[PDB]
């Protein structure tokens, strides 16, 4: 087999391999997500295709379970492996425990994989950063972000991909108790969070929402334009 | 060292002044200055086809050279001094944009050094252009003096006629060298500017 | 334990690019598919008269209806003989039938694909010509070090293959008898090989309805009348 | 880079394998073998650097099986390794197929073992060439030579070592005359070869001569006392 | 890159491990405290944005009722070690039906840290050392015990040890203020004074986390009640 | 960049019009000047190796040689004109330099190797131009020192040595000059595909 | 062992990309030009043959066009050796699916199954990645007629029309211009391939032997796949032969 | 660039012209000039045993209590050598031009055939440095001798002045015998450099090849 | 390229003559010239220990003829032919090694690298021989111009004091050159003889291909 260390230290202590991994995270498309009041909403920009691609495989907003969904920004390659093996854990947790999955329980097992891939022999750190968001028991939503390094955080409003820091500046300034008040204001905030990094993109914004007991629902392009129609 | 919000900020203002000039030069001064040399080379005085008429006949006091060629030297000399000034302003600006020295993420620093080394070719050539012009004065002045010393050899009169053409030939070369000094330099700056002015940094890792 | 084959900045495979360069530096080899049979002609060059000719043969049979030739590194071909013969027997176990030419060369080239991928193993420096007869259809295939097998009515390889292909652009016609195709391949190697032309130096074999049969030097001497 | 490990050279060569060919040549010993009509003889240089060394303790003639002899030329480190590995094969042959291994398959299996050294980059070729002899009931005397690259072929007259170039020339001169093949007179040809090349007239202890015959398929080593008889008494 | 992991230096040091201890200088400043009446550990959360929740991030977790934790540098490297540390801790009570001593906690962690290697092992082995500086406190029948651990893997009983970026001047400052029988409440005072001085941000209940362990009181995580009291009682 | 939006499009004159103007010189001007120098090489005055026939009469105890000046009248415009065309090729490569990147820089290395050979040719013709001015300086100083030489026939006769060498060098210059036109077009036209488009400008997201 | 010669594909560039993957996309561009079209009546697939010689035979059904299963097929542009590895793995995944659910595998499921194997070598193992780009056609019970394109990095996506290999920038540009979304069907849109394959091929006088065309259409509840007759494709080219005059 | 069936052929024919000339140089011109320079060096003019034979007599009487010329033999020997110098330099530049016209596109694949062309190019530039210098050395021997003769007649006192004139006569004489041996050898050297590698010099990469990788 | 039969013969005769000359260079020329200069060093002409008596003081003024140093001028008759000879012979050695360059291959080239190191060592000797030619012409230019400068200047006598130093510096250099020339003969012998195996036969041509 192939056995050697990949990521090694540096004279300044920083990790060459891991920093280049987070660099590829920023090179990907811009994805955003927020934790609403009674709901959760995800969104990601779409590079504009010209009259070709099908939106079934292109959709970057997936669902790990009925309780928890996710989005990703980075290399599309490593994203599909995490989505598959996380859904396995969701069914394995229900197989082991009759109680449903917990957003914090599933999130840690995800980022824990990327930590294993970093320190394992011959493996590689992923170039993806995923937003794990879902509903806990009693209906309390939770939004967590992963890291190629294996850490995970908690975020009320979050933005990933290209210009993630630029949108985060719009977040911290315009995020207040006025934000994510209602299902409408939560979605309009996600749209406005994608309006800074958009250059003549227009309709390219696609949205998704999960409402209480119901599972992730994809807003139709016309339903998206309904909330996009109000800008000024 | 400590912090001096006044005296140390005067250095930052000196940098912000050069940063303000650099953007003003690229968007205004350079595009106009490069075009001014185009019409300068298209001037019919530099397009002269027959150089047999510009040969200065020597009387062998009644000693003089071609005044039209000297005027052509007097027209090119300011343009040589104008690019040297603009060459030093960019060279200083490139040095003040150098970030701190670190082992990692040093690729962008080498990119700034690669563009910086492209200026060294211009520092030497521009000084050699004006020095060569001043050398023509001594060559043509001594050729007439040697002809005035021994009134025998007629090749010194042909040597002056050659140096009369040798100047004009190198003028048209230098005019193209001066125009290429602005034009190529203006393209190199635009080729490395926009997102590579700050190649790395302001990105980090979300954690540590 | 690591594969040394990497992608060049132009996209080419550097290790396999030099693999064929070793194949072109070997002995010339040609083949022709015409009429009911396929002929394969190779040139065996010893280093002196002190080496036995009949001891080692370049033309080797695989199964009754299939045989192979080669140009390239000698030892690398001996590995493929064991793996091709053993693969055909594993075929005969499952389907209890002789192996077709298309099925054989596929998984035989897969061995080339494995060692151009799995680590710690160099690619092959050989290129093989595949001769087979199945269900009345003659099969002439050409394999390379990379593992890509094509279909050819006629082909040339080894040394001076450019002039060999030029001869096949003219001397090779359709509806050509197998016996005339053998003498045609001799005319192709007439310019390439120099010096003394004998029946022991040239090695020829064919496959037809009766199956793959290697030719003896005595029979080749009659085929050298041209 | 290509000159160190085993990878394809831009000209198609293998330098790790070719530097091995100079390693067999580096051993400083020249070996010759000739295949006769009724016999196959091997004559190699037997070197004794110091008198404190012993004869039977250092020998270049090894027995793979009873009916197959083996001679080795190169750095002795790689010499003993192949012989033990060959005996793990020749013996295994009888455990499976139930008869003495032929010289054809013995050279084929040993080559395959050496072919892995060239194909697998983890290992290295071995610095000793192997010349295997024997006899079969069909082709009679069998003489093969296996290089570290894995190539082997029937050789009527073979040679190895520093003088291999000069040895091959004199072996051609004898065969060019259609030299009549008899047992002991062929033993002279292999001995006279090394004798004319170096221009020495070796002592009986300075050479090592193996023999195999149709009458005696079991490999034998010529006695040094019998060597002295056919050196001095017959130089003719 | 033109060097190995286990390659020795001409001065007798490891290239790999030397940069490990060199890497921990970028971590978060934290200090442990060992008192006669109990053990006290504090850590700076170092929150990079108000949207990031300081309550979810925990650099001090409960292994056993006696033993706490500490984290610095890369957070996930500590989480990997604390996971197996909590497994072997319950494996102790699963056999001997008793709480694991503070010493046996670090012995299990020191074994897991020393196993670092690449070749001649399984893929499930950790290839590179952790960039974490560990502080394991606790109180048992033997009394309060506080241990220090670095990427090398050693554990030594110490009254107070500073970790993180400020560990240089903090460890010398912890020496001066802490002496003799100084107790819990008196330790929190000098703790929050030195920490607030070295870190950039001002002291706040949500900017740092504090927890203590006593002989009669097991590991108790300080909530908004206890955190807001000790910051204004400094 | 937030640069001024005026005069920005004025660079298209030198990046396209002048860029295409240098293109017309490669496949048209350069080959036509090769046949022109061929007519200069067919001149029978370059094939004469006889000293007395080449050198002009000189009377010293001042007659010069105007036949070499007639050759210089042909050599000077031709050697000096190609220098401008080589300078235009240097700038022609400058417009084709892609933006800074790590990978796919093999096309940049091609432009560096070609432009380095252009600077070599530019230096060779520059050393020729310096030598052209040296024919009058050396010959003028030769007869000047020989004008004071009376009893010495050695140095006075050696003045004609540079007069004969002038014919052989100018013939070697024009012969090497004619090659410079073909070598300039041969190097460019070969790699022209990769010089104009050093990276085929192809970047896929996927990530 | 000799870490000096280890290329370490898993190492990221300072630009944050992969060395081998970036050079893999270029190697695909050197291959032949291949295109595909998703229409209403079915899927359309056409491929040029860059190999041109008088001694070529191609006894098989097609060169760059293969049949994955009953309901699906594929094309290829890239390294010809690694294509047979991916083709076999697609046939293994599709048949192992038939074991459990006893039903034909949908189009999207079979594509994402191999792409996990493609990028698994870029994630670890130290083995070189695959330089093969594959086009996917077929029909499934739900989504129906589908057209998919794959990349050597493991990324993929759905496409109504696309092109792979040489002349990718020119063909795809010429494809979109006249492409009729959900309108122009097999009969009509088959004339576009011949029109595009003539423009993509630099050598004029497009030959029916130099190209290959295969279609897949489900009719009467049964999937039908065939390779179009060269004699008819010639007449299909005879259409394009009379197109510039009229 | 536009395609010109004529202007482009002007360079192609110019390359084909150098191909025919190079074959005439290596096959005919070089072997012929080796024998001519061999007899020119073995000539009794350059075969003189004592260097004092070519000392140019100059009568410059030292004051005791004028006619000055050069050596006629040296001038003629230099008059014969200069055409061979002008011929070897011009033809070497044509061979140098021919090899640069044989340089294909710049690619990494099979670029070691061009690396052989680079080594041959460096060997010709080494010859170009020596041959062009010899043309300059003789031009220096003219100025150095003419000035030393003038200085010898300027100060007819020190015996080293009239001696230095005779030493430069001995110097130029032995310098001629060296430069003739250089050009005579440079023909065979460049002949052996090209002919051995001519297989890879004319064909840097194959002829026409590639597998459609 | 194409060529006739006489073309090979003109080169072959050069290959035979230069090979026989190189063989007579190592085993005849070199051992003869090593002892030749060694006898000149032991000869009382070059063995003079007193450098003060070897000087030729000249008067400082129908002006009397001022000769050069009789010792230096007579010893340069030994030095000068040896400087021209060694330079001519090294060229034949440099050229003959260049003909031994095997057909250039991109691998197994260390046999060529050996010849490259030999050529660089001979080029270093050839450069020092050319420096000896400058030294021979230096004494005539330095002594000549200065003595007349010392003749026209009667106020500054110490010009002749340097002329006395030119006599001592020359004899020191005249002996140092022939000492180095004999060393050059010894260096060319040991380098060529020990490396003669790889110079003539850089490639064994054992390639089995």
Q: Which domains does chain A have, with CATH numbers?
A: 9-232 (3.60.20.10)
Q: How many CB atoms lie within 10 A of CB E185?
A: 13
Q: What is the 3-state composition of chain I as percent helix, strand, coil, each rounded to the nearest 5?
A: 75, 0, 25
- Give chain D's count of helices (H) and strands (E): 6, 10
Token digits for C39?
Answer: 């002929």
Q: Provide, as residue numbers in chain C, all residues whose Cβ is less than 8 Å from the Cβ of D121.
A: 4, 120-122
Q: Please report residues of G whose CB lies closer than 8 A to that of C102.
A: 59-60
Q: Does E126 touch chain B (CB under 8 A)?
A: no
Of G179, G104, G188, whose CA–CA distance to G138 is shortest?
A: G104
Look at chain G and report how many structural domains it folds into.
1
Cα separations in angstroms, C208 against B133, C61, C130, C212, F151: 88, 13, 14, 6, 102
Contacts with C25 from chain I: Cβ below 8 Å: 209
| Separation between Cα atoms, residue E211 and residue E45, nearest integer Å | 13
Q: What is the DSSP letter of H68?
A: B
Burial H134-168 (b: 16+ CB within 10 A, else e): bbebbbebbbbbbebbbbbbebbbbbbbbbbbbbb
Strands (E), chain C: 29-34, 37-43, 60-63, 66-72, 126-134, 137-143, 149-151, 154-157, 202-208, 211-214
Yes or no: say if C30 and D16 are a contact pair by the CB < 8 Å rule. no
Name which of D15, D21, D151 is nearest I107 (Cβ-Cβ): D15
Order of all β-strands in the sheet with C66-72: C60-63, C66-72, C126-134, C137-143, C149-151
Alpha carbon E70 to its chain centroid, in Å, reads 3
> Using CB atoms, which residue from E49, E128, E131 is nearest to A5?
E128
Q: How far apart are CA D182 and CA A206, in angstroms?
A: 95
Three-state SS for H124? helix
- CA–CA distances in Å: residue I184 to residues I30, I87, I171: 10, 11, 19
**What is the CATH number for C47?**
3.60.20.10
G contact test, residue of H107, H108, H212 with most G CBs within 10 A: H212
C148-186 in b/e form (b: 16+ CB < 10 A) is bbbbbbbbbbbbbbeebbebbeebbeeebebeebbbbbb
Chain centroid, CA B89 distance in Å: 12
If you measure CA to CA, which chain E residue comes closest to B208?
Answer: E74
CA distances for E225 relative to B173, E46, E52, E215, H41, angstroms: 83, 21, 22, 22, 111
E22: Cα separation from own chain's centroid: 17
Question: Which SS3 state, helix, strand or coil, does residue G133 take?
Answer: strand
- Nearest CA-CA partner of H12 in B75, D208, I131, H3: H3
Phi, psi of D32 (to 5 degrees): -135, 150
Find where tokens 């032309």 sit: C197
CATH code for the domain in which residue G152 is found:
3.60.20.10
In Å, how far are A93, B82, D42, H172, I33 from B45, measured between CA atoms? Answer: 89, 21, 95, 51, 71
Measured over the CA atoms of residue I35, residue I37, residue I42 and residue I44, the dihedral's sign is: positive
Q: How many residues are recorded in chain H?
A: 213
Domain carrying residue G24? 2-246
Closest residue in A to F206 (Cα) is A76
Q: CA nearest G46: which of G239, G233, G238?
A: G233
Residue of chain D minimizing CA distance to C126: D12
Q: Do G1 and D1 touch (CB under 8 A)?
A: no
Q: How far, CA to CA in Å, does E54 sit from each of A156, B109, E58, H181?
A: 12, 37, 8, 90
Quote the CA–CA distance of H100 and D134 in Å, as a whole number. 60
How distant, in Å, are the alpha carbons of A78, C42, C200 from that of C221? 65, 15, 9
For β-strands C154-157 and C202-208, DSSP reports them as unpaired
Six-digit token pair at H143? 């100025």
Q: Do F103 and C10 touch (CB under 8 A)?
A: no
Distance from CA of F110 to the nearest CA of H (A): 7
Return the residues preceding each gap in chain B, C–N over 2.5 A, or none.
60
I chain contacts of residue D12, beta-carbon cutoff 8 Å: 209
Beta strand pairing status for E38-44 and E208-213? antiparallel
Contact C169 G84 (CB under 8 A): no
Q: How far apart are the first and last CA of chain G?
A: 69
- Token pair 């043309």 in the structure block, residue: H135
Residue C218 DSSP SS3: helix
The CB density around residue H10, as the number of other CB atoms within 10 Å, is 20
- Looking at the complex, report in whole angstroms how far the Cα of residue C101 sits from the nearest Cα belonging to chain D: 26
Resolution to 1 decimal, in Å? 4.1
Out of H32, H63, H200, name the one closest to residue I62 (CB): H63
What is the least distance, in Å, from the CA of D102 to any CA of chain C? 13
- Shortest CA distance to F43 belongs to which of F164, F166, F136, F170? F170
User: Using CA atoms, how far apart are residues A145 and A207, in angstroms rounded to an integer?
Assistant: 18
Contact C10 F106 (CB under 8 A): yes
Inspect the interface and report whether the beta carbons of D121 and C120 lie closer than 8 Å: yes
Cα G11 to chain centroid, rounded: 30
Instruction: Provide the CATH number for the domain formed by D1-236 in this structure.
Output: 3.60.20.10
Please, what is the angle between helix I5-24 and helix H30-41, to 10°?
40
* Interatomic CA distance for residues D160 and D73, integer angstroms: 7
Q: Tokens representing I98?
A: 């260049």
- Positions of E strands within chain E: 30-35, 38-44, 134-140, 143-149, 156-157, 162-163, 208-213, 220-221
Q: How far, in Å, CA of A134 to CA of A104, rounded?
A: 9
Residue C9 touches partner H, C-beta closer than 8 Å: yes
Question: Is the backbone of residue F116 left (phi > 0), alpha (psi -120 to 50) or beta?
Answer: alpha
User: Are G211 and G232 in contact, with CB atoms under 8 Å apart?
Assistant: no
Whether residue E153 contacts residue E114, with contact meaning beta carbons closer than 8 Å, is answered with yes
What distance in Å separates the CA atoms of residue G208 and residue G210, rounded to the nearest whole number? 6
User: Given the structure tokens 């056609």, which residue do they identify?
Assistant: G137
Q: Does A8 touch chain B (CB under 8 A)?
A: no
Query: Edge-to-edge strand order for the sheet containing E134-140?
Result: E134-140, E143-149, E156-157
8 Å CB contact of C75 and D13? no
The answer to whether residue H211 neighbours chain G at the CB level (below 8 Å) is no
Kindly tell me the number of DSSP H helices and DSSP E strands found in chain F. Answer: 8, 0
Smallest CA–CA distance, residue D122 to chain C, in Å, is 6
Distance CA G69, CA G95 (A): 9
Residue B38 buriedness (CB in 10 A; 0-12 / 13-18 / 19+): middle
Cα separation, G124 vs A81, in Å, equals: 13
Which residues are within 8 A (CB) of H178 and not within 5 positions of it... i.e. 6 or more apart? I87, I88, I91
DSSP E68: -
In CATH, the architecture of E2-234 is 4-Layer Sandwich (3.60)
Chains H and F touch (3+ CB pairs under 8 A): yes
B:165-184 residues touching chain A, CB 8 A cutoff: none
Measured in whole angstroms, how far is the alpha carbon of residue A121 from the centre of its chain?
A: 28
Size of interface A-B (CB pairs under 8 A): 23
Question: End-to-end alpha-carbon separation of chain F, Å?
Answer: 26
Please report where in the chains the tokens 């590194």 appear, as a residue. C73
Q: Tell me the count of B-F CB pairs closer than 8 A.
A: 108
Cβ neighbours of E162 (radius 10 Å): 24
Smallest Cβ–Cβ distance between C56 and the set D12, D118, D153 belongs to D153
Closest CA to C155 of C12, C22, C33, C17: C33
Sign of CA dihedral F2, F5, F7, F12: positive
Q: Which of B148, B131, B135, B6 has its CA nearest to residue B64? A: B148
Cα separation, I89 vs I93, in Å, equals 6
Q: Residue ranges of the domains in chain D?
A: 1-236
Burial classification of residue E13, based on how many CB atoms lie within 10 Å of its CB (0-12 exposed, 13-18 middle, 19 or more buried): exposed
The secondary element (H helix, E strand) that includes residue B44 is none
For the range D221-228, what are the long-range contacts, defined as Cβ-Cβ under 8 Å and sequence gap of 24 or more?
Answer: D221/D59, D221/D61, D222/D187, D224/D55, D228/D204
């Amino acid at each position: 087999s192939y056995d050697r260390a990949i990521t090694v230290f540096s004279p300044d202590g920083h990790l060459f391999q891991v920093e280049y991994a987070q660099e590829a995270v920023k090179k990907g498309s811009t994805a955003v997500g927020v934790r609403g009041k009674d709901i959760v909403v995800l969104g990601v920009e779409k590079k504009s295709v010209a009259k070709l691609q099908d939106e079934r495989t292109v959709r970057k907003i997936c669902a790990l379970d009925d309780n928890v969904c996710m989005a990703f920004a980075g290399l599309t390659a490593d994203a599909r492996i995490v989505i598959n093996r996380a859904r396995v854990e969701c069914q394995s947790h229900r197989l082991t425990v009759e109680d449903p999955v917990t957003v914090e329980y599933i999130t840690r097992y995800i980022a824990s994989l990327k930590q294993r891939y970093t320190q394992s022999n011959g493996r590689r750190p992923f170039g993806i950063s995923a937003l794990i968001v879902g509903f806990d028991f009693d209906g309390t939503p939770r939004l967590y972000q992963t890291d190629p390094s294996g850490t995970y955080h908690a975020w009320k409003a979050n933005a990933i991909g290209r210009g993630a820091k630029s949108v985060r500046e719009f977040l911290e300034k315009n995020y207040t108790d006025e934000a994510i008040e209602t299902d409408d204001l939560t979605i309009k905030l996600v749209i406005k969070a994608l309006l800074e990094v958009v250059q003549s993109g227009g309709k390219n914004i696609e949205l998704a929402v999960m409402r209480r007991d119901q599972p992730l629902k994809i807003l139709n392009p016309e339903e998206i334009e309904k909330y996009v129609a109000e800008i000024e | 060292l400590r912090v001096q919000p006044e005296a140390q900020a005067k250095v930052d203002v000196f940098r912000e002044d050069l940063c303000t000039k650099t953007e003003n030069l690229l968007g205004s001064y350079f595009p106009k200055k490069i075009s001014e040399l185009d019409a300068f080379l298209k001037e019919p005085a530099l397009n002269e086809a027959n150089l047999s008429n510009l040969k200065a006949p020597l009387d062998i006091g009644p000693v003089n050279c071609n005044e039209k060629i000297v005027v052509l030297l007097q027209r090119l000399k300011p343009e040589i001094k104008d690019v040297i000034e603009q060459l030093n302003l960019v060279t200083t600006w490139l040095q003040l944009q150098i970030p701190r020295i670190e082992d990692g993420n040093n690729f962008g620093v080498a990119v700034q050094e690669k563009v910086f080394e492209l200026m060294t070719s211009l520092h030497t050539k521009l000084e050699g252009f004006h020095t060569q012009i001043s050398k023509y004065f001594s060559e043509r002045g001594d050729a007439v003096t040697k002809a005035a010393k021994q009134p025998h050899v007629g090749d010194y009169r042909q040597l002056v006629h050659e140096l009369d053409e040798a100047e004009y030939r190198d003028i048209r070369l230098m005019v193209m060298e001066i125009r290429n000094a602005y034009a190529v330099l203006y393209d190199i700056i635009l080729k490395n500017f926009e997102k590579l002015k700050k190649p790395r940094g302001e990105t980090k890792g979300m954690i540590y | 334990s690591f594969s040394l084959t990497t992608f060049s900045p132009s996209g080419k495979l550097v290790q396999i690019e030099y693999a064929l360069a070793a194949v072109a530096g070997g002995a010339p080899s040609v083949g022709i598919k015409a009429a009911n049979g396929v002929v394969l002609a190779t040139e065996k060059k010893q280093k002196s008269i002190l080496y036995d000719e009949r001891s080692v043969h370049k033309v080797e049979p695989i199964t009754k209806h299939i045989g192979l030739v080669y140009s390239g590194m000698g030892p690398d071909y001996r590995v493929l003989v064991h793996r091709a013969r053993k693969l055909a027997q594993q075929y005969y176990l499952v389907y209890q039938e002789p192996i077709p030419t298309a099925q054989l060369v596929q998984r035989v080239a897969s061995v080339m694909q494995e060692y151009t991928q799995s680590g710690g193993v160099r690619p092959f420096g050989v290129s093989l010509l595949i001769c087979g007869w199945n269900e009345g259809r003659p099969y002439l295939f050409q394999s390379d070090p990379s593992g890509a097998y094509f279909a050819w009515k006629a082909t040339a390889m080894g040394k001076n293959y450019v002039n060999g292909k030029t001869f096949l652009e003219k001397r090779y016609n359709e509806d050509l008898e197998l016996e005339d195709a053998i003498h045609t391949a001799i005319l192709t190697l007439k310019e390439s090989f120099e010096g003394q032309m004998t029946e022991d130096n040239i090695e020829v074999g064919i496959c037809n309805e009766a199956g793959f049969r290697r030719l003896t030097p005595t029979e080749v001497k009659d085929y050298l009348a041209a | 880079f290509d000159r160190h490990i085993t990878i394809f050279s831009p000209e198609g060569r293998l330098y790790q394998v070719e530097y091995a060919f100079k390693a067999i040549n580096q051993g400083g010993l020249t070996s010759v073998a000739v295949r006769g009509k009724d016999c196959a003889v091997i004559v190699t240089q037997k070197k004794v650097p110091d008198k404190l060394l012993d004869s039977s303790t250092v020998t270049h003639l090894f027995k793979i099986t009873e009916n197959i002899g083996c001679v080795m030329t190169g750095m002795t480190a790689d010499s003993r390794s192949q012989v033990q590995r060959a005996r793990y094969e020749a013996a295994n042959w009888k455990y499976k197929y139930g008869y003495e291994i032929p010289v054809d398959m013995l050279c084929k299996r040993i080559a395959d073992i050496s072919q892995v050294y060239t194909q697998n980059a983890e290992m290295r070729p071995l610095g000793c060439c192997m010349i295997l002899i024997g006899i079969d009931e069909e082709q009679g005397p069998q003489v093969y030579k296996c290089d570290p690259a894995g190539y082997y072929c029937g050789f009527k007259a073979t040679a190895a070592g520093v003088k291999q170039t000069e040895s091959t020339s004199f072996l051609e001169k004898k065969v060019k005359k259609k030299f009549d093949w008899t047992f002991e007179q062929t033993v002279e040809t292999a001995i006279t070869c090394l004798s004319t090349v170096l221009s020495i007239d070796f002592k009986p202890s300075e050479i090592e001569v193996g023999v195999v015959t149709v009458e005696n398929p079991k490999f034998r080593i010529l006695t040094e006392a019998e060597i002295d008889a056919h050196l001095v008494a017959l130089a003719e | 890159y033109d060097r190995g992991v286990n390659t020795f230096s001409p001065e007798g040091r490891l290239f790999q491990v030397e940069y490990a201890i060199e890497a921990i200088k970028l971590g978060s400043t934290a200090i442990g405290i060992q008192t006669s009446e109990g053990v006290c550990l504090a850590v700076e959360k170092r929150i990079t944005s108000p949207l990031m929740e300081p309550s979810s991030i925990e650099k001090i977790v409960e292994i056993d009722a006696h033993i706490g934790c500490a984290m610095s540098g890369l957070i996930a490297d500590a989480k990997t070690l604390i996971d197996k540390a909590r497994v072997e801790t319950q494996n102790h009570w699963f056999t001997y039906n008793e709480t694991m001593t503070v010493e046996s906690v670090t012995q299990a962690v020191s074994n897991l840290a020393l196993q670092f290697g690449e070749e001649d092992a399984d893929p499930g082995a950790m290839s590179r050392p952790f960039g974490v500086a560990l502080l394991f406190g606790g109180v048992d029948e033997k009394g309060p015990q506080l241990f220090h651990m670095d990427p090398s893997g050693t554990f030594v009983q110490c009254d107070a040890r500073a970790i993180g970026s400020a560990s240089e001047g903090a460890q010398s400052s912890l020496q001066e203020v802490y002496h003799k029988s100084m107790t819990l409440k008196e330790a929190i005072k000098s703790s929050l004074i030195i920490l607030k001085q070295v870190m950039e941000e001002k002291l706040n209940a949500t900017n740092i986390e504090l927890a203590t362990v006593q002989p009669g009181q097991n590991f108790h995580m300080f909530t908004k009640e206890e955190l807001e009291e000790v910051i204004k009682d400094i | 960049v937030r640069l001024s939006g005026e005069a920005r499009k004025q660079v298209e004159v030198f990046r396209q019009n002048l860029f295409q103007e240098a293109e017309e010189f490669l496949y048209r001007f350069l080959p036509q000047k090769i046949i022109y120098l061929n007519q200069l090489l067919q001149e029978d005055s370059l094939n004469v190796a006889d000293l007395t026939s080449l050198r002009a009469p000189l009377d010293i105890p001042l007659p010069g040689n105007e036949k070499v000046l007639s050759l210089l009248a042909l050599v000077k415009p031709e050697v000096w004109t190609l220098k401008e065309k080589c300078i235009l090729v240097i700038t022609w490569i400058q417009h084709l330099i892609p933006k800074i990147e790590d990978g796919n820089d093999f096309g940049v290395a091609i432009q560096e190797k070609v432009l380095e050979r252009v600077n070599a040719v530019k230096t060779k013709v520059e050393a020729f131009q310096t030598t052209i001015s040296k024919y009058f300086s050396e010959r003028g100083d030769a007869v000047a020192k020989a004008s004071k030489e009376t009893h010495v026939m050695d140095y006075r006769a050696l003045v004609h040595e540079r007069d004969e060498a002038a014919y052989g060098e100018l013939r070697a210059m024009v012969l090497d000059l004619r090659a410079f036109y073909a070598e300039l077009y041969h190097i460019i036209s070969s790699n022209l595909e990769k010089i104009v488009n050093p990276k085929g400008e192809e970047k896929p997201s996927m990530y | 062992m000799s870490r000096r010669y280890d290329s370490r594909t898993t190492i990221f560039s300072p630009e944050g990309r992969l060395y081998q993957v970036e050079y893999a996309m270029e190697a695909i561009g050197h291959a032949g030009t291949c295109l595909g079209i998703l229409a209403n009546d079915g899927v359309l697939l056409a491929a040029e043959r860059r190999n041109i010689h008088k001694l070529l035979d191609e006894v098989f059904f097609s060169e760059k066009i293969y049949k994955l299963n009953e309901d699906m097929a594929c094309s290829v542009a890239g390294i010809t050796s690694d294509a047979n590895v991916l083709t076999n793995e697609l046939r293994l995944i599709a048949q192992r699916y038939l074991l459990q659910y006893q039903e034909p595998i949908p189009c999207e499921q079979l594509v994402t199954a191999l792409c996990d194997i493609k990028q698994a070598y870029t994630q670890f193992g130290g083995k070189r990645p695959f330089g093969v780009s594959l086009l996917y056609i077929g029909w499934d019970k739900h989504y129906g007629f589908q057209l998919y394109q794959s990349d050597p990095s493991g990324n993929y996506g759905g496409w109504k029309a696309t092109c792979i290999g040489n002349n990718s920038a020119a063909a795809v540009s010429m494809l979109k211009q006249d492409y009729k979304e959900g309108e122009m069907t097999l009969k009509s849109a088959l004339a576009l391939a011949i029109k595009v394959l003539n423009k993509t091929m630099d050598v004029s006088k497009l030959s029916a032997e130099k190209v290959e065309i295969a279609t897949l259409t489900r009719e009467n509840g049964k999937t039908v796949i065939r390779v179009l007759k060269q004699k008819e494709v010639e007449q299909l080219i005879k259409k394009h032969e009379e197109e510039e005059a009229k």
